[PDB]
Structures are given as C-alpha cells and as structure tokens.
C-alpha cells in the first residue's frame, strides 16, 4: 500500500518473475545447494548478464577454484570472460590457498579479506559483489555458533559498503537443514535453495526462494534446467495472451472431420484425440500434419513411440510421401523416446524446436506415452506448460492420449487433462457382428455445434472413410451394441 | 465457573478468537519458528496495533538487526515507525553487536540488559515489551541445561516489572522439537509455534498455540497468510449470521430453470452445478452472471480454467457481450490459474475481491479444477470458508464441479462437498439413438418443490432450450436408456 | 486369588476406573509428559479432591513456579487455594531458585530437601505428597546414570516416611522414550504417561498407565479433556444399565411411521436414518423433535451442517414453528460445526448439554458429517460413547447418516456402525418414469414386526405423505426398476 524497497534485475529468464523484480539492492543473498546443482553458474550468470546489459561491473571472489579453470568452464557456455577481464569490467579475485603454506592461524583472515574485496571494488567501480564457496574460510577450523559472528560481520560490512552480494553455501542432504550448520539462514536476508532430488532413478532440479525480508515473492519450488545458455528457470504466468480467434479456421486435414466440426477446428485451440490402441490416432495426427503442404505452411511432428523409418513406411502405406515435405522444408520429425530424457527437459526441447522452426501446427503423438513413470502433478505441469506455450503464439496443436481399458469404459482421460483441451475426438471399438469395427465421435467443442452423433469409420488404402451412423443399435460406448 | 485471568488484545485479526481474547497480561509468550515464517512481523504488528488503537507505548529489543533496516522493512507494509519514534511512542532498543569488539565474556550481559530495558520502560511508560531473536545472547556461548536459568531469570524479572512480553526463538526442523534446545517450552507460560511446512512442492503457513497456563484456547493448527497488511489469520466461526431469506428470490438467468426451481433460487444460498466435461456448466455460469445486468446489480466471475478472451469469444458466440457489462462497471473477471498460487491464498484473494467490488452474485467456475493437487481436508476447508463468507454477507453463490467418470456413475461429487451446498443441478450425457444428447435435472432443493423430473436440453445459438422429458425410456442416470 | 495391596482414591473422575481403585498407598507415581499436557493440573487436582472429600492434608512442591502464580492459575478453575492455605490444610513449599544467587554446587541439595519436606509433613499431618517438576534438581548439573541414585534415594525415603507421592517429569518426543533420560521408568513403581499427539493438524490428549507393581489396571491409551472443572477422563464401562423397556413406546412423530414400526419406536433405543443427500432425513429429525411438544416433554437438537436460521426457515416452510417451542423451554439448538472442535470434545459437549437440559429425546443431525477427517476407530469410539450414554439414561435417540454413493448401492453405512443401532430406516431414490421419486423402508427392527415392505413417499407442504407400495416393479434398491 506504500513504497517498497528497490531491487535490481539479474536478467535471468524466469527468476525476475519469481522474486517480483530481482534481488534487493544493498542486502545479501544466500544460494545454498548440494554438490553439482548450479550454485557457481548462478553467480557467473548473475555477473555476466549484469555486465552485458546495464554495463555494471562486478567482482568474483574464489576460494577453491583457480580463475583460469573458471574461465575455461565458462567458455563452453559461449560467453568469454578473459576478454571482459582485459577490458577492466570483471575482476576474479583469487583467495584460493597455496598447496604449500602454513596453518598457524585458523580463520582470522576475514579482516584482510574484506579489505582485499574493498580496494578491488574501489578500483573497478563494481556493483555486483559475488562471493562463491564462502563456506571454506569461516568454517575451515571453526565449530557451530562461532560462524554466526563471522557471517554477521561479513554481511554487515557488505551492507555498509552498499553493493549487491550473492553467497554460496553447501549442503549434505536434500530435504534436511538448509545449510551445513543450520545457522546461516538467520543471517542472510535472502535465502535461495537449489535442489537435485532423485526419485525413480531420475534427477529433477528445482529452485526455491525461502525468505525475502521486506518484499514479496513466490512461495514453493520451481523447476529449472541447465541448458547450453545457462540456467533457464521456467515461470508460471499466462496473462500475456489477450487475443482470440472467432474468425477464419484452419482445416483439420479430413474434409469429413471438418464438416463434423463445423468448418475447421479454430485458428488456435488444443485438440485432443483419445481412444484405445490400434484405433487410428496416428492416422489423424498424420492427416493433421500433412494438410500444411496444401497452404504452404510449416508444421512439425513429435514422435514418442515410433521412429522415423516406421513413420515414413506407414505414411507411404497411406499415400502421404513425407519425404516431399521434408525436402521442401515444410516438415520436421523429432523422433525421441520418453525415457531418453526426463519429463522437464522435454518441454525445453519442444520450446526450442518451436522457436527455431517457427511452425504453425504442432502435433505431439502419444501424450500418455510420456506419462507412465512420472506422477500426476508433473504430467499436469507439463501439459499446462505445453498448452500455454502453444496458445500464447497462435499455434493449432493436436495431441494424442491412448487409454488402458480398451473396450467400453468411462473417464476418457486417466490423467484428468481433458479439462484443459478445447476439442475432444472420441475413438473407440464397436463390436458389430463379431468383427470389431471402429467408430468416431466428436465429444465436445468450445465454440461450434460439432455434429452430436456417432459415426462408424474404417481405414482404407487412402485415408479415413467415415460411414453414416449407428442408428439401429444401443449403448454404443459400452462396447456392446444390442440392435433393436 | 469462576473469575479468570485478565488478557489484553493484540488487535491482530484472527488471533483474538483463537486465544479467547489475546495474550495474558503480565506473563511472557514464546513465538518460535523456522527461518522465514513471520516471527519478527508478529512482534512488530503486536507493537504497532497496540500503539495505534489503545495508545499503549512499547519497546522493541534487537540483537541481530539494526533499527534502520527494521524501519525500512516495515515501511513496505504501509506503517511508519520513524514518525512514532520521533513522537516518543516507540523505542527500538539496540543491542546488536559491533563487528569490531571483544569476546572475553560469553553471555554474562543479562544483568545489564534488564537494567537497559527497564530504564527505557521507565522513560517511555511502555506496556508491551517485545524481545526479538532472544536466542542469540543466552545461547551464544552456552550449552544445554544452562540456558534454563537464563530464561528463568529473564521471565522472572520481566514479570517483576509487570509488562506483556513476546519472545522469539528459532527452530531447525518443522515437526521435531519446539525450540533449538528443547528446554524453552517449560519456562514460558505461553508457547506459539509458527510453521512453514512443505509438501507437494508447495508451502503452507500455519499457526498453533501450544499452551496457555491458566486459561483456554483453540487446540490445533490454523493457517495464515502474510499479505500486504501483515499477518492475517483466518479464524473458524459462523455464529455471526442470524438472518435467513424465505422472502423474495433472485432469478437464475434462465426462465425455464426459474420455473423448474419454483420462482428463483433464493436471495442467499449455495448453488452447485455438476456433471461431466463439455456438458454446459460454463453456459449456466454465464447466464447466472449476465442476469445482473437486468436489475443493475454487480456480480463478478472467477475463472480457473479459461482466460478472458476465451470467455469473451464463447460469450459472444452465445449472445452475451460481456464488454458492455465490463464498461458499465457491472462485471469483473479475475482469470487466474489454480497452480499459480496455493489453495490457501485463493480464499484471501476471493475475500479481497468481494470486499473491494461489493457484489451481489459470485460465480466460481470449476471448483474441482483447484481440487486436484491438494488433499481432501484442505479442499473441504476452502469450500467451507468460501461458503461461509458468501452466506454471512447475503450473497447468492453458484459453483461448478466436473466429474471424472463421464457416463453413468454415482457419487455426484468426488470430494463429498454435497452436504454444504443448498441446490444441486444434475447435468449428464444421455445416449439417445447414437447421437449423445444431454439432459438437465434439479437434484435437490432446500425449501421448494423443485420439479422432480428429468429434462432433455440442447445448446442453441442463443441459450439453453430445455425440451420436455424422458418419459418413454428407463434408467437415465446409468447412461444407457432402454425405451419401452 | 488372594488379598491385594491397598490403594487410595484420587477422586479424579474417570481415573479411578482405569487403575482399579486409585494410586497405591505408600509408593510413588511418575506422571511424565510433553510441555502443555496437564502434568501440573493432575497434581493440583489430586491434592484438592483429597482435601475436599476425605479431609486429607497434602503438600505441594515447586521448583520453577512461584506459589502465587499457581494460586492465580488454579483460581480460574473455580477452586481457591489461598483459603485452604490459611486453614492449614494445604502447604505449597517453595524451592524455586532466587534469580540472584550462587552456583558453586550443582545439585547436592536433596539431603536438605528431604528434611524440608519431612518437617512440613510433620507440621501439617499431610498424607498426599506431590513433588512437581522434579526434573530440575537431580538433572540440573548431572549426566545420565547419575540421576538413578538420586531418584532411588528420593523414592526410598518417601516410602520410608509412608505417604503417597506423585512426581512430574518432562519429555522431548511423543512416541519415543518415556522420560528425558530413559532411566526414571525403572525406579518409580507407577508410571503414568500423558500425550498430546498431533495428526491431521488436530491435537488429541490421551492417558496411559504403563506399569503398576503388584496390582492390575487397564492397558492402552484412554482419551481425556481439560475442561473448566479440571481433567475429566472418559472411561469405558456399561455395567450400570440393568433395565430395558418392553413396555409403552414413544411416538416417532409421523403416525404412518408409527404404524409401520408397530406403534412407536421404544422408550429407549438407537434409531438410525440413512440414505443419500436431499432425501428427507432432516424432515424425519424435525418430526422426531417436534413431537415432544405434544406431550410437554423436553427434547434438544444437534446441528452440524445447518445454521439455526436456516433450520427455522425450513421448519416454517413445513409448518413447524420452532420459536414457540424455544419460548416454551421445550427445545434447544446447538448449531455447531464439525471442524470447529475435534471429535474428542464433541462427546463432552453433548454430555454437558444432556446433563444441563435433562431432555427426553436426542436427535444428532448428520452423524457422518463429523466422520470425514477422523479415522474409523475414533468415530467408532465416539458413536459407542454417544449410544451408551444415551442408553444408560433411558433416552430415545435418533441419528442421521448420509451415504456417498447416491444411486443403487450396498453397505448401508460406510463407517460400519449399523450393528450398534436398534432400528434402521432406509431412504433411497427410485427412478420412476424419469422423474426421480423417493421411497422409505424400515430395514430392521429389534423387537417388533416393523412392516417388511417398501413404501414410496413425497414431501408436501405439511409433512411426509407416504404412498402405498412398489408392487409392480423389480430391483427397486438398485436404482433402476423394471416394471413387469
Ligand atoms: N555446457 C553445459 N551444458 C549443460 N549442463 C552443463 C554444462 N556445463 C555444466 N553443466 C552442468 O552444470 C552443473 C555444474 O554447476 P556449477 O559447476 O556451476 O556448480 P556446482 O557443481 O553445483 O557447485 P560446486 O562447485 O560447489 O560443486 C553440473 O550439473 C553440470 O553437469
Ligand atoms: N495400409 C493399411 N491398410 C489397412 N489398415 C491399415 C493400413 N495401415 C494402417 N492400418 C490400420 O491402422 C491401425 C494402426 O493404428 P494407427 O497407426 O492408425 O495408430 P493409432 O491407433 O491412432 O495409434 P498408435 O500408433 O499410438 O497405436 C490398424 O487398425 C491398422 O489396421
Ligand atoms: N510486503 C510483503 N508482502 C508479503 N510478504 C512479505 C512482505 N514483506 C515480507 N514478507 C514475507 O514475510 C516473511 C518475513 O518475515 P520476518 O522477516 O518478519 O521474519 P522471519 O524471516 O520469519 O524471521 P527471522 O528474521 O528470524 O528469520 C517472509 O516470508 C517474506 O517473504
Ligand atoms: N455457438 C455454439 N453453438 C453450439 N454449441 C455450442 C456453442 N458454443 C458452445 N457450444 C457447446 O457448449 C459446450 C461446451 O461446454 P461449455 O463451454 O458450455 O461448458 P461446460 O461443459 O458447462 O464446462 P467446462 O467449460 O468446464 O467444460 C459443447 O457442448 C458445445 O457444443
Ligand atoms: N480453564 C481452563 N480451561 C481449559 N483448559 C485449560 C484451562 N486452564 C488451563 N488449561 C489447559 O491446561 C494445560 C495447562 O496444563 P498445566 O499448566 O497444569 O501443565 P503443563 O503445561 O502440561 O506442564 P508444565 O508447566 O510442566 O509445562 C494447557 O493445555 C492449557 O491450555
Ligand atoms: N417446502 C417444501 N416443499 C417441497 N419440498 C420441500 C420443501 N422443503 C424441503 N423440501 C424437500 O426437502 C428435501 C431437502 O432435504 P431435507 O432438508 O428434507 O433433508 P435430508 O435430505 O433428510 O438431509 P440433509 O439436509 O442432511 O441433506 C428436498 O427433496 C426438497 O424438495
Ligand atoms: Mg561451485
Ligand atoms: Mg501412435
Ligand atoms: Mg527475524
Ligand atoms: Mg467450464
Ligand atoms: Mg507444569
Ligand atoms: Mg440435513
């Protein structure tokens, strides 16, 4: 209701939305995690993005890594730090110990380490101080309830100087105490916790802001992924899209399905195709993708069960010839497996492919095939992220979800994601005269009349040939027609 | 049965109902919690609300935060503390250690700290002493079973002075021991525990009063929220409402549904609409909201599965034109997501919107969409709180709950919240001649005759056109009619 | 098989049945618990009830609380201890330490504490010694396996003097070791453990006697409640009732239901009404309660999902006018919530209301509404307690249990409490011609013929008008009749 504290931007994607603007100006920030979770990378990215964008110099204090190894590690990410060192914009301070030395004094070097930082700030005019692996000096020969005074005097001095500070501390566990001694949380005004929790022989990185004194933030754990461009925090917000399309509709690919949907799906929506296995869902996906060749539009395909060669053979058995659209740069196939990578990296891969190719239609084959190992909440998060990222860029997406109970059941989606989609097409098996025929049904719509009827369809050598109706039977969806 | 001890009001909303009047007068109170849970904010709010309301001065003792940082943090909440310091109403005593000093004596400073506090009490005529972060002096260089005497002499001399005291202690765990040494619970006469427990990658703040010597309170854990106005504890009590409305009823929006319900729902009730997905629940919500434009009444809409445009386009496809009601200040759309914030914060958001807009009808779309990740007890608490806040302010509320098992099932609500609502409307699918039609049914009412029949309806380009009946069929609810 | 040891009564209500007569005479008793569970209150009540009833003087030993604070705390319960101190019947000895003193000797003061107790016993002729917070002297500066000798010499000396002793020890956990050092259990001949275990954000107090050397007791945990009159333990025993009523019956309220049950329920029984929601259970409860106005009898009503004014509005919509019975002191309404207090306290509230009002009929609306959060064993204990306490005072009780599966189901009660009740009335939904009609059925009886038939009824503007039968249908209970 009144004025708030000032805070400066770290320019990391996703993090500036979690903390409502960035780290506070003047205070410190504790970034604590297990080994191999991204504590050092956070500090280096926080320095580099501030140097490049706002021309704000910063220093980097080291305690167990030599500067040239840090530059060598950072070179693989793309950014060059030696050039910025030569330009006088970045200064890696070296406090790593000589392997040959003396140990006559335990930890009474902080009073000189402060001055070693302070003069360097006064010659480089730095703004972002970033002490890394600070838990190697104040705890080298000290026990508990002694490091409290050292951390207090350090944070108080960096507040007296008036620069943004980021610290780094190690952990022993994943869900236990936040730091090694359980006392560093009550000193730093900002606590950020990185986790690398392992469940079901799969790793998953998460970020959490525990406490921000004086301001507000997001409470809970938010996943991230260490890609080739650094930390990529995935946010949760879809207030950007303020547009809809009641105007001209894109074609489905089957003229009968367009007639049954009223003239096209929509320009942007989420189409869900469901049913049992062997019913014809991949045919619907292939007809949805191949239609982009008619209007010279770009559409790509995600495969999670098949593999390229088999997809081309099945397409040529239907008369599709995907090599022509592949050669015309109107088609791309990813052809990955659900267990090759974790579920969180699949969203980043899809986002990267969508950004690079810039397509108009996305078809994710077998959305339930990558929903087996993971729990319900992670799959719901993945589905919500995919649907939001497709909806905010006016892309017509079609998904596919096979069911376990093959003959007449209920609960159309076992993962309960039918409420996010816009259109639902119901495929099923209909036992007619002991020959196991199949039928189609437009279950629901979000803006047109959608032809409330049940249509028998077959699979010919060209495509889906939809027949008239089941008008002289009873209880069709239960897999047991009784003619009357 | 006899006279009780006196107690004074902290003027924090929610807390004065839990403790039956406030903290006791003369004794102390221990507020222990994990880092980042609201221990300091409780003390500052307890001082400020007592200064503003009853003109009672108070002191604030600090041990690890400088006074100007505390004033800067408190400025973001709206209240100014520097002005009250200049007015002589508040005194922040400073006992934080100088970073450059001496450590010849561990913690033998309480005999001077009592005099330092008492001299300020005698010069400011304070009533509310509030020692914060007390677990940094008596335990700075002391082991277990030694801090017992220090806390005992602290509480004894603060009771000899005779003022209300609030203490602050840290924790290491969430469900383990109450304090850091497991001994401070047996000294303080009042123990309040703050928790920040994490489950399902979501945080949830709770408050609990463990023991009040001499009086009664509420036993258990009660949730709270740190909003922009401080700690806002949600209580549990609905004895305020002593009014009912057997008189004039508000219209539903559909004249056929009003005829089927007997002339309107009621002035105040809880309407529940249920069924499977794609059945027409959002149409019922839209017709319930749009009817407020006829009588120049204010009504708002909560959306948890759509987003503005998706709602405006669907409304214009039915002939509603929500932009006119938005411009005439008779409609507001929230358009949030269930996973954006936790379930605990949604109740506060709804309460704030209801208080600010002052509407007459509330429509919460998809009450089951925010009941997925959370457990049953939390969702029941949320539903009970929403219904109580709607009922105590004579507001006609309509909710929406989709079911998982889409065809013929039982157990109308999977979360078993059917005993809180007042009206239940049953929407379902009816497989007729293999065209999959839909039907309506007023399942129950709480004061009218409500037309016990099953009516087929369709969705036209204007609204719901309800047809006559299913009089020549059988077992309609089971999703498989057999005509006779 | 032979003579047993003598034991004297503590006159605590509930405790004298668990321990088969009270604490043994001459020995000691250890009462150990967590902070805030009722250890001190047990000692004070044990002294007070022995002073008032048998005129037996007793002493109270303090180690961390001053006597005037103890008197101030005990004054809130109703009893005054200052007058008893002035009468020379009670002596609170003060051994609390001066905040200003010396610590040259750790804990070698027990040899003087023995004489200080012994002189007081010889000056007041006391019988009940009660040492409170004894775990502050022998463990103040002592380690493990050292307090064994101190506790041994203390218990041996109090046995040599020959007086009943009650001790108090603290805990750290809830289900771990019994005492702080795990050694005090093997010294005291009697061990009583108090627990304050927390589950589902709800507290629940239990009492357990671990060991009584030489005699017998009850094994397990027994719940208790700290009310305004002290500790009030609920026991488990129903050997008091030796009466039954095959004679004159009380009316149900509906003359058709009395004819269908054979002329009235009984003078004392347990009536259960079940079915789905919206079926007419509250109407049956209201007709059962309102009938007491005809014979000038007193009956009360418990509501757990209504709101007083709503009950009056629904009653006036049926033609009942509860305000006349409220003004004539023949009606009382509680109007509470199931989540306002725990299930443990609801039995105490019902017992207090029954004792104060002295009614003839009890009607607890929605017995399943307060059976959601709790487990099955706690709800079974609550039902058994309510039914036993209603049966032992010849009170005709009627209950209400809604089912989750609304359509044709089985297992009439999901909590399996159908075997406790005496009569069961089956309410259900019967789909007739697609209009969803309702029907009644007296499922079982315990002493009359009860008219084995299924009767359709409706709800008119006056009351339940029961129609003839379903004699031309089949499979009525399964919710889908087929006429033949
Ligand atoms: N080019 C890269 N692409 C993808 N992941 C990378 C790349 N370079 C490094 N990583 C990953 O980043 C992590 C390295 O993090 P970083 O070295 O910055 O800190 P840390 O290992 O968590 O800290 P500490 O040095 O204290 O153990 C590892 O998980 C590593 O696999
Ligand atoms: N040339 C063909 N002639 C006849 N039927 C064919 C031909 N090619 C494929 N089919 C039919 O296609 C079906 C195989 O399933 P399809 O590849 O269409 O995928 P889907 O069932 O939609 O899903 P998924 O691939 O995930 O199982 C079978 O019913 C098979 O008979
Ligand atoms: N304006 C605000 N709006 C919302 N939440 C806020 C605001 N200001 C602070 N908070 C929250 O309040 C908490 C800060 O609590 P406070 O600093 O009073 O004590 P604490 O952090 O629990 O104690 P300690 O300093 O001992 O760790 C954090 O969770 C922070 O996110
Ligand atoms: N212009 C239209 N013409 C015909 N039918 C329409 C039109 N707009 C919407 N519908 C129908 O509305 C239904 C979509 O559901 P609706 O938006 O009414 O919400 P709901 O089923 O009550 O709930 P939810 O949005 O949670 O799924 C479909 O049956 C669809 O055919
Ligand atoms: N008048 C009262 N009505 C209801 N409950 C009360 C009343 N007075 C006290 N209590 C409750 O009784 C308990 C106090 O117990 P008591 O002070 O006798 O011992 P204790 O707190 O368990 O022991 P210790 O002081 O060693 O921690 C608390 O739970 C308090 O809420
Ligand atoms: N004035 C009235 N006219 C017609 N029917 C009424 C009237 N008042 C109530 N009803 C009927 O009463 C039923 C509502 O349930 P009722 O209040 O009788 O409680 P219940 O079903 O026994 O249980 P509960 O209240 O626990 O759900 C509906 O069937 C409704 O039609
Ligand atoms: Mg590192
Ligand atoms: Mg496939
Ligand atoms: Mg604090
Ligand atoms: Mg909807
Ligand atoms: Mg006590
Ligand atoms: Mg009822």
């Amino acid at each position: 209701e009144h004025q708030a504290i000032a805070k400066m931007r770290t320019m990391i994607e996703g993090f500036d939305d979690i903390s409502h603007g960035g780290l506070p100006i003047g205070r410190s920030t504790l970034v604590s995690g297990t080994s191999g979770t991204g504590k050092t990378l956070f500090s280096i990215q926080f320095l580099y993005n501030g140097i490049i964008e706002f021309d704000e110099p910063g220093v980097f204090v080291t305690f167990e890594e030599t500067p040239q190894d840090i530059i060598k590690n950072a070179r693989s990410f793309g950014w060059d730090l030696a050039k910025l060192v030569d330009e006088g914009k970045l200064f890696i301070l070296d406090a790593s110990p000589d392997p040959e030395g003396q140990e006559v004094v335990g930890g009474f070097d902080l009073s000189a380490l402060i001055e070693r930082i302070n003069y360097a700030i006064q010659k480089y005019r730095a703004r972002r101080v970033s002490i890394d692996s600070v838990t190697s000096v104040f705890q080298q020969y000290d026990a508990s309830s002694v490091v409290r005074r050292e951390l207090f005097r350090l944070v108080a001095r960096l507040k007296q100087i008036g620069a943004t500070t980021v610290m780094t501390t190690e952990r022993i566990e994943e869900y236990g105490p936040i730091a090694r001694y359980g006392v560093e949380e009550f000193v730093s005004d900002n606590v950020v916790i990185l986790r690398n929790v392992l469940e079901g022989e799969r790793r998953r990185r998460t970020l959490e802001i525990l406490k921000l004194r004086g301001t507000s933030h997001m409470k809970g754990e938010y996943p991230f992924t260490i890609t080739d461009h650094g930390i990529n925090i995935f946010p949760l917000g879809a207030m950007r899209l303020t547009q809809r399309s009641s105007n001209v509709r894109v074609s489905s690919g089957v003229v009968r399905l367009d007639e049954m949907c009223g003239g096209g799906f929509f320009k942007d929506s989420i189409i869900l195709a469901t049913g049992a296995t062997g019913t014809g869902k991949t045919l619907l996906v292939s007809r949805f993708v191949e239609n982009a060749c008619a209007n010279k539009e770009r559409a790509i395909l995600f495969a999670y069960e098949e593999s390229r060669a088999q997809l081309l053979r099945n397409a040529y058995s239907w008369g599709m010839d995907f090599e022509e659209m592949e050669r015309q740069n109107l088609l791309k196939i990813v052809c990955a497996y659900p267990e090759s990578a974790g579920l969180e990296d699949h969203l980043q891969i899809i986002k990267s492919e969508i950004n690079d190719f810039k397509p108009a239609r996305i078809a994710i084959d077998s959305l339930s095939a990558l929903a087996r190992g993971v729990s319900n909440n992670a799959f719901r998060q993945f589905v919500i992220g995919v649907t939001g990222y497709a909806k905010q860029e006016e892309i017509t997406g079609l998904f596919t979800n096979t069911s376990d109970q093959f003959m007449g059941a209920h609960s159309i989606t076992d993962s309960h994601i039918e409420e996010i989609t816009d259109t639902i097409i119901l495929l099923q098996y209909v036992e007619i005269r002991g020959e196991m025929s199949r039928a189609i049904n437009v279950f629901k719509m979000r803006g047109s009349w959608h032809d409330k009827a049940i249509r028998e369809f077959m699979i010919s050598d060209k495509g889906p040939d939809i027949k008239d109706s089941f008008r002289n039977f009873e209880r069709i969806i239960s897999g047991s027609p009784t003619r009357i």
Side-chain angles (χ1 to χ4, degrees), chain A residues 246-313:
Chain A
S246 187
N247 53 5
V248 287
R249 304 141 91 91
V250 310
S251 170
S252 162
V254 189
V255 61
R256 189 79 195 108
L257 197 65
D258 278 333
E259 290 265 19
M260 289 174 64
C261 290
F265 283 143
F266 282 116
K267 177 60 183 314
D268 54 33
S269 63
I270 303 292
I271 296 97
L272 184 70
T274 177
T277 180
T279 318
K281 298 185 288 297
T282 297
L283 182 62
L284 294 196
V285 173
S286 174
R287 274 300 193 123
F288 182 70
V289 175
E290 190 274 331
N291 184 268
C293 193
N295 312 60
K296 298 294 183 290
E297 312 206 300
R298 303 204 287 283
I300 72 152
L301 197 157
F302 294 96
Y304 288 119
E305 25 197 34
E306 304 249 44
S307 240
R308 229 337 194 44
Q310 195 158 39
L311 281 187
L312 311 183
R313 162 171 69 111

Side-chain angles (χ1 to χ4, degrees), chain A residues 388-404:
Chain A
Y389 183 75
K391 253 172 182 164
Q392 80 161 40
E393 303 200 65
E394 64 183 1
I395 294 174
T396 302
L398 183 156
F399 300 147
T400 298
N401 166 82
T402 182
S403 70
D404 297 332

Side-chain angles (χ1 to χ4, degrees), chain A residues 156-212:
Chain A
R157 176 44 151 190
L158 276 296
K159 204 184 295 183
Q160 283 169 12
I161 299 163
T164 313
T165 318
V166 171
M167 311 205 158
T168 291
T169 300
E170 318 179 327
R171 299 178 74 191
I172 308 314
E173 301 187 51
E174 286 287 327
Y175 276 129
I178 314 289
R180 191 185 285 272
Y181 300 84
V183 68
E184 313 207 45
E185 316 94 358
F186 318 102
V187 191
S188 277
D189 296 329
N190 319 314
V191 186
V192 192
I193 312 154
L194 308 164
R195 295 179 218 257
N196 197 5
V197 67
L198 166 78
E199 58 196 290
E201 303 182 352
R202 290 264 72 79
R203 295 292 197 165
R204 180 177 204 268
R205 312 182 176 275
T206 60
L207 190 137
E208 168 197 9
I209 293 187
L210 185 54
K211 155 188 59 174
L212 286 176

Side-chain angles (χ1 to χ4, degrees), chain A residues 85-105:
Chain A
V85 164
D86 290 330
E87 287 181 27
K89 305 213 81 53
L90 200 152
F91 172 62
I92 297 169
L93 189 152
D94 174 85
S96 281
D98 190 359
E100 296 88 4
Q102 61 253 14
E103 289 85 30
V104 300
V105 176

